[PDB]
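Batch 3, record 17
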Amino acid sequence: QEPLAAGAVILRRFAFNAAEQLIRDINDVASQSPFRQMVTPGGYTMSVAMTNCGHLGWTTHRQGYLYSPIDPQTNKPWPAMPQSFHNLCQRAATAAGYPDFQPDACLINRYAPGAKLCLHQDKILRAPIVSVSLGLPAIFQFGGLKRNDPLKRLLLEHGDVVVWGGESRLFYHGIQPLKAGFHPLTIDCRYNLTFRQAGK
DNA sequence: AGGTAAAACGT
DNA sequence: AACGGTATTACCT
Ligand SMILES: O=C(O)CCC(=O)C(=O)O
Ligand SMILES: [Mn+2]
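Prediction for the assembled complex:
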């Protein structure tokens, strides 16, 4: 449990023991709602490929960003949140000092070599974010409330969990372009799980 | 009024 | 290649 910011902590290798099962469940989720690279409102295809599980999934469309109960690619509900995901999330939230967190949304990100996520805030209720890294390492940027607030850069390795909330809830953060490499469990990619409470 | 796109090129 | 401009507006509710 390392002090990233007010309300924020990195729990290194927290999910290491759970990771094989987590990855099996990512595969099961994506067999129903496939990974897709979404298109921004501005018309650019994101380098990260995404899917979701739980009641609500994050998606883009022409008018903005949206949490939706329906996957617009399949026209069916997102797959149910795996119990492995929910149990890990709750354990990590508890360890980070957010014992009452009840997520209803899990965004699954797959990073191939070169994929990034430019600095952004998680907007759209005042609950924490629990963010689980799997596979290849990546450099995570964590800033402040303003885009030009100085950035901490942290290598996130397989099994690391970052939790933010309270004063750091809306802080800008991001992922630098993924370096190529090998990981025994994911082979050639990084996955992240982002748990939120997106609904009432 | 106030929130949201940019979760996306030049130096 | 780290930093910051752009939304310094347009278009919604
Ligand atoms: O991949 C990560 O560690 C961060 C992902 C993220 O910020 C998001 O999906 O909103
Ligand atoms: Mn985010």
